[PDB]
Design an enzyme around this catalytic site. Structure first.
Site, PDB file in Angstrom:
ATOM      1  N   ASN A   1      32.902  29.900  68.086  1.00 27.13           N
ATOM      2  CA  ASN A   1      33.782  30.137  66.723  1.00 27.13           C
ATOM      3  C   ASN A   1      33.127  31.282  66.922  1.00 27.13           C
ATOM      4  O   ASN A   1      34.446  32.549  65.909  1.00 27.13           O
ATOM      5  CB  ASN A   1      34.625  29.030  66.334  1.00 27.13           C
TER       6      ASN A   1
ATOM      7  N   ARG B   1      42.177  30.023  62.059  1.00 27.91           N
ATOM      8  CA  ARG B   1      41.540  30.739  63.077  1.00 27.91           C
ATOM      9  C   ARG B   1      40.850  31.713  63.682  1.00 27.91           C
ATOM     10  O   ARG B   1      40.095  31.956  63.715  1.00 27.91           O
ATOM     11  CB  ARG B   1      43.034  30.110  63.996  1.00 27.91           C
TER      12      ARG B   1
ATOM     13  N   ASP C   1      34.303  35.438  62.794  1.00 29.27           N
ATOM     14  CA  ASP C   1      34.636  35.053  63.355  1.00 29.27           C
ATOM     15  C   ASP C   1      34.778  36.012  65.124  1.00 29.27           C
ATOM     16  O   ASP C   1      35.464  36.976  64.740  1.00 29.27           O
ATOM     17  CB  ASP C   1      36.162  34.835  62.689  1.00 29.27           C
TER      18      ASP C   1
ATOM     19  N   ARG D   1      29.644  19.868  73.995  1.00 27.46           N
ATOM     20  CA  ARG D   1      30.505  19.904  73.270  1.00 27.46           C
ATOM     21  C   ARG D   1      31.059  20.856  72.180  1.00 27.46           C
ATOM     22  O   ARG D   1      30.414  21.953  72.108  1.00 27.46           O
ATOM     23  CB  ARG D   1      29.784  19.477  71.307  1.00 27.46           C
TER      24      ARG D   1
ATOM     25  N   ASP E   1      32.148  23.492  69.170  1.00 17.10           N
ATOM     26  CA  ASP E   1      32.049  23.246  67.929  1.00 17.10           C
ATOM     27  C   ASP E   1      33.354  24.401  67.565  1.00 17.10           C
ATOM     28  O   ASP E   1      33.858  25.097  67.531  1.00 17.10           O
ATOM     29  CB  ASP E   1      30.751  24.033  67.131  1.00 17.10           C
TER      30      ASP E   1
ATOM     31  N   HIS F   1      39.227  25.925  65.076  1.00 11.40           N
ATOM     32  CA  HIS F   1      39.371  26.847  64.318  1.00 11.40           C
ATOM     33  C   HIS F   1      39.510  28.562  65.020  1.00 11.40           C
ATOM     34  O   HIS F   1      38.930  29.462  64.957  1.00 11.40           O
ATOM     35  CB  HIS F   1      37.488  27.438  63.428  1.00 11.40           C
TER      36      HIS F   1
ATOM     37  N   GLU G   1      35.238  19.102  68.782  1.00 12.81           N
ATOM     38  CA  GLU G   1      34.922  19.024  67.589  1.00 12.81           C
ATOM     39  C   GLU G   1      36.551  19.655  66.720  1.00 12.81           C
ATOM     40  O   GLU G   1      36.332  20.595  66.311  1.00 12.81           O
ATOM     41  CB  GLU G   1      33.866  19.871  66.927  1.00 12.81           C
TER      42      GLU G   1
ATOM     43  N   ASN H   1      27.726  11.379  62.633  1.00 14.23           N
ATOM     44  CA  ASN H   1      27.580  12.496  62.985  1.00 14.23           C
ATOM     45  C   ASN H   1      25.884  13.265  62.158  1.00 14.23           C
ATOM     46  O   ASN H   1      26.396  13.001  60.977  1.00 14.23           O
ATOM     47  CB  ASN H   1      28.149  13.598  63.675  1.00 14.23           C
TER      48      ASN H   1
ATOM     49  N   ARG I   1      29.011   7.684  71.754  1.00 10.57           N
ATOM     50  CA  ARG I   1      28.060   8.844  71.144  1.00 10.57           C
ATOM     51  C   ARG I   1      27.720   8.168  70.007  1.00 10.57           C
ATOM     52  O   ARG I   1      27.689   8.121  69.193  1.00 10.57           O
ATOM     53  CB  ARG I   1      28.878  10.084  71.229  1.00 10.57           C
TER      54      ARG I   1
HETATM   55 CA   LIG Z   1      38.308  31.719  64.994  1.00  9.59          CA
HETATM   56 CL   LIG Z   2      30.853  16.170  66.469  1.00 12.67          CL
END
Ligand SMILES: [Ca+2]
Ligand SMILES: [Cl-]
Length: 496
Positions: free
Chosen positions: A100, A158, A167, A195, A197, A201, A233, A298, A337
């Site tokens: 991201n 976003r 970003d 995964r 992240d 976003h 996520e 987590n 998990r």
């Molecule tokens: Ca973003």
């Molecule tokens: Cl996570």
């Protein structure tokens, strides 16, 4: 993207949080393989900022500087060695993909990075990629600060900076391609999935455009046509214009409702009790089981970050935690998990853990190796929850009962419950303030079974409790409310 790509008969991933590659490789060989662990989620393997104030926090790994595989966990030779060695014994590696964003916009320019690469946040300069100002969303973001201010506005969530994190302009093919180049590097090495992240976003479509450029998995280990496992996520507890379901196109999504609710139930907070778990799953308002990536805690929420708040159970509340993790691993909902943590010097001050930033055990910033004690626990302040007998044995219970239906549910209207997984396993829980003593239908073949919570089956006998199932499938269970582990689990492979 929905298939885990674990070996057949292996059903869980363990997060070996901040572990070094040489330690994960060995752990695959000496423990994860013979104990039937499906795979390992690794900390971000790409170069990040070395943040020295505070001193090397876990969260520096969420501030990329390049896509060089060069971290406190190890270098590229070590990463490659780990992945090969793990795949060679049937244990997969899943990468924490931080995609991201790059680092915080107010971090100083310099070479304070895990591989010594130069970068300059202020002038938007990451020449080890390379990225420049053209590659960030500064002109797309419509907030006054340039950061995310309002989660009721999906567009800014976003297009603007998450707490000042630069970003990336994932609408641009060049950015999408640099990122895909990183992920393809990892795939070809042998990685089974990712995964993703900070998925909330990113536009689902932008993630899609990145996934489109990815190779199939490495054909020495995976059947040809295999696609990386993807779990994104997204923290979605309701009430936001962004929804977990918006990401189903790309893969599975983290179900943060899971551990928040389960934590509340096991703590018996908010009027909640275990008898209410009979309809656990979509009955509690969760996403479809076949898209859920579930977990008790987590790396963020075990230390009060992300979401779940105070109800989240962790190794710190070991007794209740084991029960929660066991209920998870016994119940068919989701892909499971298991967390594996390090002990940090937790210290509260008007309600905050002021040491919630602290990184892994270290000598002057060099991550400590994982030592293994005589009793197979870890030293060097590694908690190694995945090695706690009660957890490790529940990881194999999930393997043994894989595909079997939830059946033979029992409850006392309070906190004494039991259920089975077809004819392959049965589990019993006492979270009431009195003894649980009752003969129950287990669904299992008649026999003597080891309780895998208090003990282990070792060549013809049990080191813990023994449960006696009669020819009609019934068996007596007695669990005191002051039991240190007030639950019992038996299954087809714990039978003498
Ligand atoms: Ca973003
Ligand atoms: Cl996570």
């Amino acid at each position: 993207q929905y298939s885990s790509n674990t070996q057949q008969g292996r059903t869980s991933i363990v997060h070996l949080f901040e572990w070094r590659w040489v330690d994960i490789a060995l752990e695959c060989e000496r423990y994860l393989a013979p104990k039937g662990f499906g795979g390992v989620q690794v900390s971000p393997p790409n170069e990040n900022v070395a943040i020295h104030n505070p001193f090397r926090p876990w969260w520096e790994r969420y501030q990329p500087v390049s896509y060089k595989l060069c971290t406190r966990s190890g270098n590229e030779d070590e990463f490659r060695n780990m992945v090969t060695r793990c795949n060679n014994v049937g244990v997969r590696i899943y990468v924490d993909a931080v995609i991201n964003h790059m680092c915080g916009n107010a971090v100083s320019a310099g070479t304070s990075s895990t591989c010594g690469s130069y970068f300059n946040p202020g002038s938007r300069d990451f020449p080890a990629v390379p990225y420049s100002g053209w590659d960030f969303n500064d002109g797309k973001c419509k907030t006054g600060s340039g950061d995310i201010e309002n989660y009721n506005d999906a567009t800014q969530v976003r297009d603007c900076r998450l707490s000042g994190l630069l970003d990336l302009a994932l609408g641009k093919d060049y950015v999408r391609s640099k990122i895909a180049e990183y992920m393809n590097h990892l795939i070809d090495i042998g990685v089974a999935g990712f995964r993703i992240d900070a998925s909330k976003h990113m536009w689902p479509g932008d993630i899609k455009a990145i996934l489109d450029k990815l190779h199939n998995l490495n054909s020495n280990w995976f059947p040809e046509g295999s696609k990386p496992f993807i779990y994104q996520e997204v923290i979605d507890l309701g009430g936001e214009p962004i929804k977990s379901s918006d990401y189903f196109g790309n893969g599975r999504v983290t179900e943060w409702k899971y551990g928040a609710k389960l934590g509340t139930v096991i703590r018996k907070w908010n009027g909640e009790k275990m008898s209410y778990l009979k309809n656990w799953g979509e009955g509690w308002g969760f996403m479809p089981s076949d898209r859920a990536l579930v977990f008790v805690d987590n790396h963020d929420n075990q230390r009060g970050h992300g979401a779940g708040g105070a109800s989240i159970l962790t190794f710190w509340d070991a007794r209740l935690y084991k029960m929660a993790v066991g209920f998870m691993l016994a119940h068919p909902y989701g892909f499971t998990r298991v967390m594996s943590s390090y002990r940090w010097p937790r210290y509260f001050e008007n309600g905050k853990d002021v040491n919630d930033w602290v990184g892994p055990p270290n000598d002057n910033g060099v991550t400590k190796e994982v030592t293994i004690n005589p009793d197979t626990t870890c030293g060097n302040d590694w908690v190694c929850e995945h090695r706690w007998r009660q957890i490790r044995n529940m990881v194999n219970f999930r393997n043994v009962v894989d595909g079997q239906p939830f059946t033979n549910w029992y409850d006392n209207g309070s906190n004494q419950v039991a259920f089975g997984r077809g004819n392959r396993g049965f589990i019993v829980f006492n979270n009431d303030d009195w003894t649980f003593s009752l003969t129950l239908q287990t669904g299992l073949p008649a026999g003597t079974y080891c309780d895998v919570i208090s003990g282990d089956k070792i060549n013809g006998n049990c080191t813990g409790i023994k449960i006696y199932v009669s020819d009609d499938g019934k068996a007596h269970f007695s669990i005191s409310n002051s039991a240190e582990d007030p639950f019992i689990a038996i299954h087809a492979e714990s039978k003498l």
